[PDB]
Amino acid sequence: VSPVIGVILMVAITVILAAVIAAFVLDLGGSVGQEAQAGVTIEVDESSQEIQVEVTSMGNSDLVKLGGATDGIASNAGSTISGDHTDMQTGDVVTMDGSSWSSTSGASASGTITAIAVIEEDETETQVASEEYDFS
């Protein structure tokens, strides 16, 4: 009689463990991480020490912002950036005049300008373009 009751109890434990593991499996099942992608052009003009950025295509993202060395520039370099860099729609233009960075403290004459695509649905951030410059 003992082994049969043991089998029944083990079956109950098996059902409970299956119920527990189902939630863990389904937790991974739903986490299909998304990735943003888009096309932006960056161009550094040596004749006037200026950098221009435009969004050629949107892809699946909905807004693009500039990162990298722009953090130091936009923070204290003030009006050397024209336009809006925190939200660039397709067809927008952002112009950065780099003549004054060589003397403005905290603004690196070298570095890199990087573009980040943003999706508000889950706060996904992805790098889409990069290009370095040297006004030193």
Residue owning tokens 């508000």: 120
CB closer to its own copies out of 72 and 104: 72
Radius of gyration, CA atoms only, the chain: 26
CB-wise, 102 or 125, nearer to its own copies? 125
C-alpha torsion sign, points 97, 98, 104, 107: positive
Total residues interacting with its own copies, rule: CB under 8 A: 77
Report which secondary-structure segment, H or E, holds 26.
helix 2-30
Give the closest residue to 73 by CA, choosing from 33, 42, 31, 102: 102
Query: How many other CB atoms are there within 10 angstroms of residue 47's CB atom?
Result: 5
By CB under 8 A, residue 98 contacts its own copies = no
Does 41 bind its own copies (CB under 8 A)? Our answer is yes
- Asked if 76 touches its own copies (CB under 8 A), the answer is no
Contact flag: residue 46 with its own copies (CB under 8 A): yes
Min dist CB 41 to its own copies, Å, is 6
Helix (H, G, I), strand (E, B) or coil at 35: coil
Tell me the closest approach of the beta carbon of residue 26 to its own copies, in angstroms: 6
64 binds its own copies (CB under 8 A): no
Could you tell me which stretch among 17-25, 73-81, 96-104 binds its own copies (CB under 8 A)?
17-25
C-alpha 42/C-alpha 79 separation (Å) is 19
Q: Which of 76, 86, 102, 130 binds its own copies (CB under 8 A)?
A: 130
User: Binding of its own copies at residue 97 (CB under 8 A)?
Assistant: no
